[PDB]
Amino acid sequence: TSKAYRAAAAKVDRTNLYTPLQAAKLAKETSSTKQDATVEVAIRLGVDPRKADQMVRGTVNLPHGTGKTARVAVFAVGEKADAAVAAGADVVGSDDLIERIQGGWLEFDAAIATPDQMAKVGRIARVLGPRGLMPNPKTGTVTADVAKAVADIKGGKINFRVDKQANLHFVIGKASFDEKLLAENYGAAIDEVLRLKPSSSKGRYLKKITVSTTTGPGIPVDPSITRNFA
Amino acid sequence: AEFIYTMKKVRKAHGDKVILDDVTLSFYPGAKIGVVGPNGAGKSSVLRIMAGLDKPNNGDAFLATGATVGILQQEPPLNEDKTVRGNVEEGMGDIKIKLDRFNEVAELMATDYTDELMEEMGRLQEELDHADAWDLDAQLEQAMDALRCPPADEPVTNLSGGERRRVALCKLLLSKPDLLLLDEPTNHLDAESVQWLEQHLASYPGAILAVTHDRYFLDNVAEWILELDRGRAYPYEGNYSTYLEKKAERLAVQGRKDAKLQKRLTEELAWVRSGAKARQAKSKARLQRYEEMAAEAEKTRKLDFEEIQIPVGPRLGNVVVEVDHLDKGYDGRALIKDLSFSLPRNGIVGVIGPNGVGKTTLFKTIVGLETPDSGSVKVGETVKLSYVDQARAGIDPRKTVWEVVSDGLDYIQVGQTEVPSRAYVSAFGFKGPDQQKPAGVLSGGERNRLNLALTLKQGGNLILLDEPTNDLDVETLGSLENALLNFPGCAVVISHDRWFLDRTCTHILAWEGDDDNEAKWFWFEGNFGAYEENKVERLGVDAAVTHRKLTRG
Amino acid sequence: VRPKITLACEVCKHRNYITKKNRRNDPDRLELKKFCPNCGKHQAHRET
RNA sequence: UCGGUACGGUUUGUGUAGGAUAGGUGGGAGACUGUGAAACCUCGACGCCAGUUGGGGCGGAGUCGUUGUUGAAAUACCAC
RNA sequence: GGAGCUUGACUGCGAGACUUACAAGUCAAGCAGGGACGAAAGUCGGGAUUAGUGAUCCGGCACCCCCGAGUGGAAGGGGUG
Ligand SMILES: Nc1ncnc2c1ncn2[C@@H]1O[C@H](COP(=O)(O)OP(=O)(O)O)[C@@H](O)[C@H]1O
Ligand SMILES: Nc1ncnc2c1ncn2[C@@H]1O[C@H](COP(=O)(O)OP(=O)(O)O)[C@@H](O)[C@H]1O
Ligand code: VO4
Ligand code: VO4
Ligand SMILES: [Mg+2]
Ligand SMILES: [Mg+2]
Ligand SMILES: [Mg+2]
Ligand SMILES: [Mg+2]
Ligand SMILES: [Mg+2]
Ligand SMILES: [Mg+2]
Ligand SMILES: [Mg+2]
Ligand SMILES: [Mg+2]
Ligand SMILES: [Mg+2]
Ligand SMILES: [Mg+2]
Ligand SMILES: [Mg+2]
Ligand SMILES: [Mg+2]
Ligand SMILES: [Mg+2]
Ligand SMILES: [Zn+2]
């Protein structure tokens, strides 16, 4: 307890499941009492991640963005390096960046590379292993024309990936947004998770869902009603 | 109610020797089951079904989906590579080739077509974050510090018997199968590798089976005893002091029930030999009940046991074995340094020390199979030497248990007498047509009994026991130690069993090396109980750890 | 003591032949080269 | 009363440098108004892998973040 | 009696006989497949020969994919060992 966490706990009921809009309504009335916040959604799936064909992994583009720094490290040499900084990449990867990441400077947020210079990716993934900032072909970060996904990672392509205990974790943007802006990222997330739903999922696929702030408690939302996120 | 392994009406039998018959039990995860029973009961034949190495005759036995099975065999094999290469063939075996391809695709893809190999490295680099397999250089270096493995750069052909078992446990404790199948894990392990494995199997996810004859390891790693009598399986709970109660009770209520049946045969055999009187008939419905009682009285006739019997040798002189300033080693590492002792006449001497410290090399300088560095070994004119060995090198697998003791000969020499060979091996329990089993099908508890038949027929008055208390159960462990106390010569024993040197010892030769010497020994005059009180008064009063986790998960 | 073993093929696993062996003189599974009519040629045959 | 299941609170994890080693994942630059170095309390949960995770006595004077690195990984706080 | 290599202790058949109330029992030249030994000729469908065994029914398992109670499947049935 903190004698202010119980103020927001006195305003949100625990047992009552809510609509996707009332979660975004109480996203404003719980987070914004404190400082700035990012809205957190935790989803417990109905899969078992021990098997191979139940590893739920995918990405989604968000329409209203997410409001973050997005320090994208695009890896390309030659004239392809200038295409990233013209597109909006602050630090463009090269060979000199390899000798300073291995020195202990890893201040970046993603890795969008080119298929010709992937030899340096396996050497730079020494310390990018447990960090999980590998270049992924399934999220479009490994592609030939790298002049597309630079502003897309800025645009809100947050990667969701199921853990060992079958718990998705995903952000739908900052807490300084509106109710019609938050619930559409909520609607675009779940509608693309169900496309990634494996065919061998026993039982109810979407068991329990919650929405939480950065300091306050979690909002129990109803997994049953998924049609009217607007 | 989710399970691991289920048996349904399993019946495995090697003909007359049944192992299972109409058995059914289920294994749930988190269970800590220790399986007990006498020697030859069938304990390793159960685990060779539960690992998928053998098939039951008429039954159903299947693992649940997922949760694979790793077995420790009773004689664990290895490969002809190094130690660091001996731990990657399992535990890292399914996952190092996914790293052997990722360091290939870093260079082979850069000159070939970069469009279809994009997902070929895609579905493998995403197999290196769920397991965190980037640290495969330094996960092996943690799993060797836990078991105190040998250094990982030398071969594995010349290792101790308890050093080969440490590198075989690392092949299974890195895999982490949810159904462990440990077959006699505390063989050849010192008092540290057992105390380590008690703590590691305490907090362990998954099901653990362990066929352990010893009384104190099963009280720490098990809480649910499974038993194998003649065919049946008796699951219950307790801590192994209740197993010897119930097997003593299951034979006292079966023994006198089979004595009431014997009196009813004598009352009925007198009726079938009494003759039919005048025109009455001897009823066929009592003849047909006699010949069913007479058939159910011969099937209960399996109650016998053979004692361990050492032949006596010639008269032993005043000088048995003298060792004066012995130095012994193989490399820059020195094992034995400046040792001076002399074996007594008519006593039992115990050799005590951890694994890989120089105990089998101490015998192999005495038997004349090594050569000392400095100092000499001196025997004497009277001593005939008899030597059992740890490796069981004399017994070959593709030759029957009879014609290894003999060589197709009828009568053998057991020291100035001629006993018949089949009469000699039947004095070692191998009776009837069990004398034609080869050495590959014998159990581990009766290769520790066959090795005593090969080497005690030398009839010597100096026997060198290199771990005889290895795979023996409680009935014949007491039969061995009662044959050493009545032995007239001198017996030297290497053993790790603390409650076996405490019972039969007169002299202790124990390793006491520390950080500045690492190669010194110590001759003590007394039993094992007085050695442990002197060990805590000379070096390190009340001083003669935390569990190394083997992994970061 | 002399059970009836059956000899399954090594390619197709068909059970083409049946015969007897001694269990105690031959504890392992017998291996013979026998004609397999499905394959049309001599294959190897362990037991089951 | 003794159990099962569903729901929610409190609490648990310590090879090796270290804040006895957040257990996992995700969010995160703030979180409370600060003395297990406290007054009634004061490890008499566990107490061993020993001191941080309670006996919740009170006080708006008095702990801790991010940085530093010292690591497979960190540090508050919190939903998961 | 001894030694070398081996699996014919074969799959598809069978002109003609013995014996015989019937049911069964027994012998078989030779033809093709794919093999073993042999330089070849050739021999090989267990053992010098005659005992070491049990009709039908009902079932079991393996394989072949023949029938599939409106249709597509399946359950069951059928063949061959
Ligand atoms: N392959 C085999 N063929 C014939 N008999 C066997 C075979 N394997 C084991 N046996 C016999 O069955 C018994 C079962 O061995 P088992 O008790 O499983 O070994 P352990 O004592 O290690 O459990 C042995 O005593 C052996 O005589
Ligand atoms: N032939 C050999 N060459 C080199 N080193 C050996 C050889 N045989 C044994 N060693 C080493 O000697 C050490 C001690 O073995 P030792 O303790 O005598 O075996 P045991 O534990 O059976 O008594 C072992 O660590 C082993 O590495
Ligand atoms: O490795 V040993 O148990 O023969 O000392
Ligand atoms: O599992 V054993 O009875 O051969 O020691
Ligand atoms: Mg065994
Ligand atoms: Mg030894
Ligand atoms: Mg033979
Ligand atoms: Mg036949
Ligand atoms: Mg005909
Ligand atoms: Mg031909
Ligand atoms: Mg030829
Ligand atoms: Mg012919
Ligand atoms: Mg005959
Ligand atoms: Mg009938
Ligand atoms: Mg139909
Ligand atoms: Mg069918
Ligand atoms: Mg036919
Ligand atoms: Zn075939």
Side-chain angles (χ1 to χ4, degrees):
Chain A
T1 61
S2 67
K3 282 89 173 66
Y5 179 74
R6 62 179 177 87
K11 294 185 286 184
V12 180
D13 187 75
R14 299 279 78 78
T15 63
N16 193 2
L17 297 175
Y18 290 153
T19 66
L21 273 303
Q22 290 179 357
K25 184 259 290 180
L26 292 173
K28 299 295 289 183
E29 294 181 355
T30 301
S31 62
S32 295
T33 304
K34 303 287 103 176
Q35 300 295 321
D36 54 352
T38 303
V39 182
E40 179 68 28
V41 173
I43 304 171
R44 188 179 67 189
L45 293 178
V47 300
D48 193 1
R50 182 79 277 280
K51 270 78 71 177
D53 53 355
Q54 292 183 358
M55 188 67 202
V56 176
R57 184 181 296 112
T59 187
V60 61
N61 194 1
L62 294 176
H64 294 285
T66 184
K68 68 185 294 294
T69 62
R71 294 179 292 174
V72 179
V74 176
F75 294 98
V77 299
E79 59 92 19
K80 300 294 190 292
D82 292 331
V85 68
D90 54 355
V91 175
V92 181
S94 179
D95 291 330
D96 55 354
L97 188 64
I98 300 167
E99 294 180 353
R100 68 184 69 188
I101 291 171
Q102 296 293 321
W105 183 65
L106 280 76
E107 292 292 328
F108 60 96
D109 294 332
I112 299 168
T114 63
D116 55 355
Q117 294 294 321
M118 294 299 290
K120 68 184 75 175
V121 176
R123 276 84 57 85
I124 205 65
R126 175 74 270 171
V127 297
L128 294 177
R131 296 293 93 195
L133 278 76
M134 51 82 71
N136 192 359
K138 270 77 68 178
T139 63
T141 63
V142 181
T143 185
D145 186 75
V146 298
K148 299 295 188 291
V150 176
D152 292 334
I153 303 300
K154 183 67 70 176
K157 286 183 179 179
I158 292 96
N159 296 321
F160 60 95
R161 185 259 189 189
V162 67
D163 58 354
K164 182 66 175 66
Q165 282 73 240
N167 293 316
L168 287 176
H169 293 279
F170 184 73
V171 290
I172 58 172
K174 296 295 287 182
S176 67
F177 290 159
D178 290 331
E179 294 179 355
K180 300 285 103 175
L181 278 75
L182 292 176
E184 293 294 327
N185 294 320
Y186 185 81
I190 299 172
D191 192 74
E192 292 291 327
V193 169
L194 295 173
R195 292 181 183 270
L196 272 299
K197 180 254 182 64
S199 65
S200 67
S201 177
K202 297 281 102 175
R204 187 175 65 246
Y205 176 71
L206 205 151
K207 287 169 93 286
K208 189 260 288 181
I209 194 163
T210 185
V211 171
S212 180
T213 70
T214 59
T215 56
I219 290 96
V221 192
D222 196 0
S224 70
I225 300 170
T226 60
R227 190 178 294 114
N228 207 166
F229 301 101
Chain B
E2 195 269 334
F3 72 100
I4 300 296
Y5 189 84
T6 50
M7 295 174 73
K8 291 182 174 66
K9 277 79 175 175
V10 178
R11 183 178 185 272
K12 184 172 174 65
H14 297 285
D16 190 75
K17 185 177 289 293
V18 296
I19 302 300
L20 287 312
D21 49 349
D22 191 76
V23 297
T24 296
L25 75 162
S26 297
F27 300 100
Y28 296 105
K32 304 294 188 291
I33 292 171
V35 175
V36 301
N39 292 322
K43 294 189 287 184
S44 295
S45 292
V46 177
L47 275 72
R48 288 197 297 270
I49 301 169
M50 297 178 70
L53 297 175
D54 289 329
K55 276 78 68 178
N57 300 119
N58 46 1
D60 289 331
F62 59 93
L63 182 66
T65 178
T68 185
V69 171
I71 185 169
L72 181 62
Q73 290 83 13
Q74 194 173 6
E75 295 293 326
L78 295 173
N79 201 359
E80 296 294 325
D81 52 359
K82 301 292 184 182
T83 297
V84 67
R85 299 293 295 163
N87 300 120
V88 298
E89 294 178 355
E90 184 67 28
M92 304 299 169
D94 55 355
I95 203 166
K96 70 179 292 294
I97 60 171
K98 272 76 177 176
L99 190 61
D100 288 331
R101 186 66 178 86
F102 183 79
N103 56 6
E104 182 180 1
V105 79
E107 291 85 4
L108 190 146
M109 184 266 284
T111 186
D112 288 331
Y113 57 96
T114 64
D115 57 354
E116 195 271 332
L117 298 175
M118 184 180 288
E119 57 91 19
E120 292 291 328
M121 63 89 68
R123 65 182 175 89
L124 300 179
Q125 193 177 4
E126 290 183 353
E127 293 181 354
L128 299 176
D129 55 354
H130 74 281
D132 198 358
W134 295 98
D135 199 72
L136 192 145
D137 196 3
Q139 285 179 355
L140 294 170
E141 295 291 327
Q142 182 180 0
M144 294 179 186
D145 289 331
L147 285 168
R148 293 177 66 88
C149 293
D153 295 332
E154 291 86 3
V156 297
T157 62
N158 291 318
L159 288 178
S160 301
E163 286 173 347
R164 294 174 64 90
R165 298 291 294 268
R166 286 179 175 176
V167 78
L169 284 177
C170 186
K171 288 176 68 176
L172 291 178
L173 297 177
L174 288 178
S175 296
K176 295 181 177 67
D178 289 329
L179 182 62
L180 281 178
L181 292 178
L182 301 180
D183 192 355
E184 300 290 328
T186 61
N187 295 336
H188 306 284
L189 294 180
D190 53 355
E192 185 179 3
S193 297
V194 174
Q195 185 182 2
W196 182 82
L197 189 61
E198 291 175 355
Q199 297 296 109
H200 180 74
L201 297 177
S203 65
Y204 182 79
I208 298 169
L209 270 76
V211 284
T212 68
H213 287 286
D214 56 355
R215 193 257 185 270
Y216 293 95
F217 179 70
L218 189 139
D219 297 342
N220 292 315
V221 304
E223 57 94 23
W224 188 263
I225 296 169
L226 186 61
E227 192 273 337
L228 274 77
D229 200 359
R230 293 178 292 172
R232 295 177 65 88
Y234 290 149
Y236 55 91
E237 65 183 1
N239 53 5
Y240 191 79
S241 179
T242 186
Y243 162 67
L244 293 176
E245 292 291 327
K246 291 180 71 174
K247 188 177 185 291
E249 185 68 28
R250 280 178 286 157
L251 269 72
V253 302
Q254 184 62 255
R256 65 181 181 269
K257 184 183 288 184
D258 291 331
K260 309 294 282 294
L261 181 63
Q262 188 64 41
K263 293 185 289 294
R264 291 178 66 189
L265 291 175
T266 63
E267 294 179 353
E268 193 70 29
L269 177 57
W271 183 78
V272 301
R273 301 180 299 181
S274 67
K277 292 182 76 69
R279 291 189 295 178
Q280 300 289 317
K282 293 178 73 67
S283 174
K284 292 191 288 186
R286 297 183 68 184
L287 270 300
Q288 292 177 357
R289 287 188 291 167
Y290 176 69
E291 288 182 352
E292 291 176 353
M293 290 171 66
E296 72 180 1
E298 60 91 20
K299 69 181 181 180
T300 187
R301 189 182 57 80
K302 294 183 290 294
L303 282 83
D304 200 0
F305 182 76
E306 290 294 328
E307 298 292 328
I308 301 299
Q309 185 176 1
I310 302 170
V312 297
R315 176 250 159 78
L316 187 63
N318 293 115
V319 173
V320 180
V321 165
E322 291 177 352
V323 170
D324 194 2
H325 294 91
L326 187 66
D327 295 332
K328 187 67 170 66
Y330 288 98
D331 281 325
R333 180 177 176 178
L335 296 173
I336 303 167
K337 181 176 173 65
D338 291 331
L339 181 57
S340 294
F341 68 98
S342 67
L343 293 179
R345 186 179 66 186
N346 195 2
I348 297 170
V349 178
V351 181
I352 296 300
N355 295 113
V357 82
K359 295 188 289 291
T360 305
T361 60
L362 186 58
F363 286 178
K364 289 186 286 185
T365 61
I366 295 171
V367 305
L369 293 175
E370 290 290 326
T371 299
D373 293 333
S374 68
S376 178
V377 56
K378 185 178 184 292
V379 178
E381 296 179 355
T382 61
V383 176
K384 286 176 69 176
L385 197 145
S386 178
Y387 175 68
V388 320
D389 51 354
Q390 184 176 3
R392 278 88 66 195
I395 173 64
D396 54 350
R398 55 182 299 276
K399 191 65 67 68
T400 70
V401 63
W402 174 64
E403 63 186 359
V404 179
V405 174
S406 174
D407 287 323
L409 277 66
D410 288 339
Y411 295 164
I412 64 170
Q413 296 288 325
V414 293
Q416 74 261 13
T417 56
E418 294 181 354
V419 296
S421 63
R422 294 186 184 273
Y424 184 67
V425 296
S426 66
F428 283 100
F430 295 101
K431 292 187 286 183
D434 290 331
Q435 295 181 358
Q436 282 75 242
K437 286 184 281 188
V441 304
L442 293 173
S443 65
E446 63 187 359
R447 286 194 295 270
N448 202 2
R449 190 184 292 269
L450 178 56
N451 197 8
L452 292 174
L454 264 297
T455 58
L456 296 175
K457 73 178 185 178
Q458 297 178 358
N461 54 3
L462 181 63
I463 54 171
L464 297 176
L465 293 179
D466 195 358
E467 293 176 351
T469 171
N470 203 5
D471 292 331
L472 298 179
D473 57 349
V474 184
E475 188 178 3
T476 192
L477 183 62
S479 177
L480 180 69
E481 65 183 358
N482 203 3
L484 296 178
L485 295 172
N486 293 320
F487 184 67
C490 184
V492 184
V493 175
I494 295 172
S495 172
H496 300 280
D497 192 1
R498 182 176 177 87
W499 290 270
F500 182 77
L501 289 314
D502 182 74
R503 197 174 301 118
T504 66
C505 276
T506 60
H507 298 89
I508 297 296
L509 177 63
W511 180 79
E512 289 182 354
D514 52 352
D515 56 355
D516 58 354
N517 198 358
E518 290 291 328
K520 65 181 179 293
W521 297 80
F522 184 76
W523 183 261
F524 185 80
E525 291 285 326
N527 53 2
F528 186 80
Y531 174 68
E532 293 293 328
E533 292 182 354
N534 206 169
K535 183 70 174 293
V536 300
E537 290 294 325
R538 290 181 292 113
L539 293 173
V541 288
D542 293 331
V545 298
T546 63
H547 182 267
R548 294 186 295 271
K549 296 294 187 291
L550 183 143
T551 185
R552 66 179 66 92
Chain C
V1 58
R2 311 294 301 271
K4 289 182 287 295
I5 59 172
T6 183
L7 296 174
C9 179
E10 290 294 325
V11 177
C12 60
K13 275 78 175 177
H14 287 177
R15 299 181 182 182
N16 297 319
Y17 298 99
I18 188 166
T19 185
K20 288 183 179 178
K21 74 176 180 69
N22 196 350
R23 190 264 314 281
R24 300 178 299 195
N25 294 329
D26 294 325
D28 55 352
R29 294 185 289 173
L30 290 176
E31 290 90 3
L32 283 77
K33 299 288 184 184
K34 302 297 286 292
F35 180 76
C36 182
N38 192 14
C39 298
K41 67 192 290 292
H42 278 80
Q43 296 294 326
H45 286 85
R46 285 187 285 110
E47 305 175 3
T48 62

